[PDB]
Paper text:
We introduced [name], [name], and [name] mutations and the resulting mutant was named Top7sm1 (sm indicates surface mutations). We mutated these two residues to serine and called this mutant Top7sm2. We scrutinized the crystal packing of Top7sm2 and found Ile68 at β-strand-4 to be a promising site for the mutation. We mutated Ile68 to arginine to introduce repulsive electrostatic force by positive charges and steric hindrance at the interface. We successfully determined the crystal structure of Top7sm2-[name] with a resolution of 1.4 Å. The crystal belongs to the P21 space group, containing two molecules in the asymmetric unit (mol-A and mol-B). As intended, the mutant formed new crystal packing without forming the continuous β-sheet string that was observed in the other [name] structures, and the R values (R/Rfree: 0.20/0.24) were dropped to a relatively decent range for the resolution. Arg68 slid by each other to avoid steric crash and repulsive electric force, as intended. Although there is no direct contact at [name], [name], and [name], these mutations seem to prevent steric crash with a neighboring molecule by the removal of the long Lys and Gln side chains. [name] and [name] mutational portions directly form a crystal contact with the Glu28 of a neighboring molecule.
Author numbering: 0 to 95
């Protein structure tokens, strides 16, 4: 339903790639999933990460953008780009 939040994750590490799709119901559940992704990226290293979140309003897209900017900064990415398509925010990070 439209109460759901959709999360798309692409973790691409010099040819070792992974793709995840999640449906989360609250900001709290979104944060749970993002913290698991951070755990994985910190342990394994990922050269490129792209996370897209389809929020429920345009204001919530910006709220989730702020969460993602902080995630990517905490993970140490050196090229971080935030884009919006409707209510969907995408953030892509790379080490170079
Ligand atoms: Mg879990």
């Amino acid at each position: 339903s439209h109460m759901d939040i959709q999360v798309q994750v692409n973790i691409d590490d010099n040819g070792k790639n992974f793709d995840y799709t999640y449906t989360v119901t609250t900001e709290s559940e979104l944060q749970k999933v993002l913290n698991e992704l951070m755990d994985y990226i910190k342990a394994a290293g990922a050269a490129r990460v792209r996370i897209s979140i389809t929020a429920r309003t345009s204001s919530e897209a910006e709220k989730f953008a702020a969460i993602l900017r902080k995630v990517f900064a905490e993970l140490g990415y050196n090229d971080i780009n935030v884009t919006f398509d409707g209510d969907t925010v995408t953030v892509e990070g790379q080490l170079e």
